[PDB]
């Protein structure tokens, strides 16, 4: 389930 | 489901 | 469904 | 439906 | 319907 | 209807 | 109607 | 009507 | 009317 | 009227 | 009137 | 009047 | 008047 | 007047 | 006057 | 005057 | 004068 | 004078 | 003078 | 289970 | 089990 | 009437 | 009348 | 009537 | 009148 | 009058 | 009627 | 009727 | 009927 | 029927 | 039927 | 049937 | 059947 | 069957 | 089968 | 089988 | 098998 | 096997 | 084996 | 072996 | 061996 | 050996 | 009756 | 009956 | 019966 | 029967 | 039977 | 039988 | 048999 | 057999 | 056998 | 054998 | 053998 | 052997 | 050998 | 040898 | 040798 | 040698 | 030598 | 020499 | 020399 | 020289 | 010189 | 025996 | 034996 | 032997 | 021997 | 020997 | 010496 | 010597 | 030797 | 010397 | 030697 | 000298 | 000098 | 030597 | 001088 | 001077 | 001067 | 030498 | 001046 | 002036 | 002026 | 003025 | 004005 | 105005 | 206005 | 307006 | 409006 | 509005 | 609203 | 609301 | 609420 | 020398 | 020298 | 010198 | 000099 | 000088 | 000077 | 001057 | 001036 | 001026 | 001015 | 002004 | 003003 949050981090960093 | 967010990141980075 | 966003990225990058 | 956007990309790149 | 845009691309590239 | 544009391309390329 | 443009192309190429 | 242009092409090529 | 141009072509080729 | 040009061609070829 | 030119051709060929 | 030229052809061929 | 030339042809052929 | 030439032909053939 | 030549032909043939 | 030549022919044939 | 030649013919034929 | 030749013919025929 | 020849003919025929 | 919190930290730091 | 608290510390420090 | 011309020919030949 | 010309021929031949 | 012309020919040839 | 010419011929032949 | 010429012939033959 | 023209030809050739 | 034209040709050639 | 036109050609060529 | 047109061609060429 | 059109071509070319 | 169209082409080119 | 279309092309090009 | 489409192309290009 | 699609491409490009 | 897809690409690009 | 996917990419990019 | 995944990436990026 | 994971990363980033 | 873990990190960060 | 643990740290931090 | 423990500390702090 | 005409001839000659 | 005409000829010649 | 006509000829010539 | 016509010719020529 | 026609020709020419 | 037609020609020409 | 047709031609030309 | 057709041609041309 | 067809051509052209 | 087809062409063109 | 096909082409074009 | 195929092309194009 | 394939191309394009 | 493959390409494209 | 591979590419793309 | 690999890339991309 | 590795990268990325 | 390692990095990242 | 180590770091991180 | 050690740190941390 | 030791500390802590 | 007919002639003339 | 016919002629002429 | 026929002619003409 | 036929002609003409 | 046929012609024409 | 033959003629006539 | 034959003629006549 | 055939022609034409 | 042959002709005629 | 064939032609045409 | 042949003709005719 | 040949013609005809 | 063939043609055409 | 050849023609014809 | 060749033609024809 | 060549053509034809 | 083939053509066309 | 070449063409054809 | 070249073409063709 | 080059083309073609 | 170049193209092609 | 360059292209192509 | 450059492209290509 | 630059691109490419 | 820059990109690329 | 900057990026990249 | 800055980042990066 | 600052961070980083 | 300050921290760091 | 101060600490640190 | 082949063509076409 | 090949083409096309 | 190759092309295409 | 290669291309394409 | 290479490309592509 | 390299690229790509 | 390097890139990529 | 380095990058990446 | 260094970075990273 | 150092950092990190 | 030092730190850390 | 010293600390710690 941590995969979801990891992916979310990639979004949140590149914004 | 993380695939959706990963793809979203590619959009958000190249904008 | 991620296919739609992937395709969208190709548009958004080449603009 | 992604086909439409893919095609659109070919237009937008060659302009 | 993507056929229309594909064809359009051939016009737009050879101009 | 794409036939019209295809034909148009042949004109536009050979000009 | 594309016939007209096709024919036109034969003129325009051989000029 | 394309017949007219076709014929015209035969003239224009043999000139 | 294309007959006129066709005939004209025979003249123009044999000159 | 194309008859005139056809005949003319016979002259012009045999000269 | 094409008769005149036709006849003329017979002269011009046998010369 | 073409009769004159026709006759002339008979002369010109048998010479 | 073509009679004159016709007659002339008979002379010219039998010479 | 063609009579003269016709007669002349009879001479010229029998010589 | 053609009579003279006609007569002449009778001489020339029987010689 | 053709009488002279006609008569002459009678001589020339019976010789 | 043709009388002389006519008479001459009678001699020449009966010889 | 043709009388002489006529008479001569009577001699020449009866010989 | 033709009388002489005429007379001569009477001799020559009755011989 | 600590993986979840570790991932959460990456989100919370890059915000 | 201390791993959970260690991870928790990383969250709590970067907030 | 052809009799007249036939007779005439016998004259015109024996002259 | 052909009799007249026939007779005339007998004269014109025996002269 | 051809008889008349035939006869005429015999005259016109023997002249 | 042909009698006169016939008689005349008998003279003109026997001369 | 033919009698006169006939008689004349009898003289002209017997001379 | 061709007889008439045939006869006419015999005249028109022997002239 | 071709006979008439054939005959006519014999005239029209020998003129 | 082709006979008629064939014959016609013989006229129209020898004129 | 092609015979008719063939014949017609012989006329139309020799004119 | 191609015979008809072939024949037609011979006419239409020699005009 | 291609024969028909081939023949047709010979017409349509020589016009 | 390709023969039919090939033939058709020869027409459609020479028009 | 590719023959059919190839032939079709020759038509569709020369129009 | 790729032959079919290749051929199809030649059509679809020249339209 | 890659041949099929390669061919397909040539179609899908030239449309 | 990578050939198949590579080919697939050429399709999926040119659409 | 890395070839397979590399190829897969080219697809998954160009979609 | 690190090659496999490296390749995997290229997929997992471009999704 | 550190190569394996390094590679693993690139995956685990880009997810 | 410290390399192994250093690498391990990069994993354990980016999770 | 202190290197090993130093490295270990980096792990044990970032957990 | 021929006797009568024969006798008549003796008169008509000796006159 | 030919006797009658033969006799008649003797009269008609000696006149 | 030819005798009758032969005899008739002797009359018709000596007239 | 040709004898009759032959005889007839002698009459018809000497007229 | 050709004799009959040959004879007939002698009549038909001497008329 | 050609003799018959040959003879016929002599008639048909001399008419 | 060609003799028959050859002869026939002589008739058919001289008409 | 070509002789027959050759002969036939002479007829068919002179008609 | 080509002789037969060649001959046939002479017929088929002169018709 | 090409001679046969060549000859055939002369027929098939002149029709 | 190419001669055969070349000849065949002349037929197949002139049809 | 390329000659054979070249020749074949001339056939296959003119059809 | 490339000649063979080049020739083959001319066939395969004109079909 | 590249010539062979180049030629091969011309075939493989025009199919 | 790069020429070989370059050529190979032209094949592998146009398929 | 880099030329070889560069060329290789063109193949490996267009597959 | 870096050129070699750079080139190698182009291969290794496009696979 | 840093160029070599930089290049090496491009390989090692794109794998 | 720090350039060398900096470059080395780029390798050692992207592995 | 501190540059060297700073660079060294970047290596020693990213391992 | 404190710079050297400060830098050294960064190494000695991150190990 | 001819003596009888000779004598008979003397009677038949003097009647 | 011809003497008999000769004598017979003297009778048959003087009748 | 021809003497017999010669004599016969004198009879057959004077009848 | 031709003498016989020559003599025969004199009979056959004067009939 | 031709003398025989020449003489024969005189018979065969005057019949 | 011709006198002998002339005399001979009188005999051969009056027989 | 002709005197003998002349005398002989008188006998052979008066018989 | 051609004399024989020449003479033969005079027969074969006048028949 | 022609006198001898002329005289001979009278004999060969009156026979 | 051509004289023989020339003469032969005169026969073969007038038949 | 032609006189001799002319005289000879009279003999060779009246035979 | 042509007189000799003309005379010769009369002989070679009347034979 | 071409004279022989030329002459031969005159035969082979008039047959 | 052409007179000689003209005369020669009459001989070479009437032979 | 062409007169000489024209005359020559008559000879070379009538041979 | 073309007259000379025209005349020459008649010879070179009728040979 | 081409004269031979030229002449040969006249034969081979008129057959 | 083209007249000379036109005339020359007739020669070079009819040869 | 193009007339000269046109004429030249006829020569260079019919050769 | 293009007329000159057009004419030139006919020469340079028919050569 | 493009007419000149168009014409030039025909030359430079047909060469 | 583009017409000039279009025409120029045809030359520069067909060269 | 882009027409000029488009045309220019055709030249600069086909060179 | 982008049309101008698009066209320019084709030139700057095909150079 | 971005169209202008997009077009500009194609130029600045293909250069 | 970001479209303008996106486009600008493509230029500033491909330069 | 962050879209503008995101786009700006791409420029400021790729520079 | 933090989105604006996040975006700003990317700019202020990549500068 | 702490999100704003967290974001702010990233800016104030990467500056 | 301590979250706000914790976040504030990160700012006030990284400044 | 091209004359030989030119002539050869006239044969090979008219066969 | 190109003349030889040009001529050769006329042969090789008309076969 | 290009003329040679141009001509060669005309051969190599029409084969 | 490019003319040589241009021409060479026409050969190498039409093979 | 680029013209040489441009031309060279046309060869190297059509092979 | 870049023109040279641009052209060179067209070669190096189409090989 | 960057144009040179840009062009160079097109070469160095397509190799 | 940065343009030079930007362009240089395109080279140095595609090698 | 930072533009220069930014560009420089793109080089120094892609090496 | 901090922009310069920021940019400098991007260089100094990617080396 | 602290911005300068902040930026400086990014350099001094990444060295 | 403490901001300056805070920033200074970040430098002085990371050295």
Residue numbers in the entry:
A (entry chain XA), B (entry chain PA), C (entry chain HA), D (entry chain 9), E (entry chain 1), F (entry chain t), ...: 101 to 115
V (entry chain N), W (entry chain P), X (entry chain L), Y (entry chain R), Z (entry chain T), AA (entry chain J), ...: 1 to 15
AQ (entry chain mA), AR (entry chain eA), AS (entry chain WA), AT (entry chain OA), AU (entry chain GA), AV (entry chain 8), ...: 401 to 415
BL (entry chain lA), BM (entry chain dA), BN (entry chain VA), BO (entry chain NA), BP (entry chain FA), BS (entry chain 7), ...: 301 to 315
BQ (entry chain cA), BR (entry chain kA), BT (entry chain UA), BV (entry chain MA), BW (entry chain EA), BY (entry chain 6), ...: 201 to 215
Reproduce the article's own wording on this structure.
Here we report seven high-resolution cryo-EM structures of filamentous peptide nanotubes based on a cross-α supramolecular architecture that provide insight into the designability of helical peptide filaments. A structural interaction is identified based on an appropriately placed pair of arginine residues (RxxxR) within the corresponding peptide sequences. This local interaction motif, designated as an arginine clasp, is robust within the context of these cross-α assemblies and can guide the coalescence of helical protofilaments into structurally defined cross-α nanotubes.
Therefore, the designed series of Form I-like peptides encompassed minimal peptide sequences in which the structurally determinative distance between the RxxxR motif and the C-terminus was systematically varied over the range from 2 to 5 heptad repeats. Three filaments, derived from peptides 15-10-3, 29-24-3, and 36-31-3, were selected for further analysis using cryo-EM imaging with direct electron detection. Five protofilaments interacted to form the 15-10-3 filament, four interacted in the 29-24-3 filament, and three interacted in the 36-31-3 filament. In each case, the α-helical protomers within a protofilament stacked along a right-handed n-start helix, in which the value of n corresponded to the number of protofilaments within a nanotube. For example, each 5-start helix of 15-10-3 passed through every fifth protomer and therefore corresponded to the axial stacking direction in a protofilament. For the 29-24-3 peptide, the interaction occurred between the C-terminus of peptide (ia) and the RxxxR motif of peptide (ib + 1), in contrast to the C5-symmetric structure of 15-10-3 that involved helices ia and ib. Despite the differences in cross-sectional geometry for the respective filaments, the helix crossing angles were remarkably similar and lay within the range from 95° to 105°.
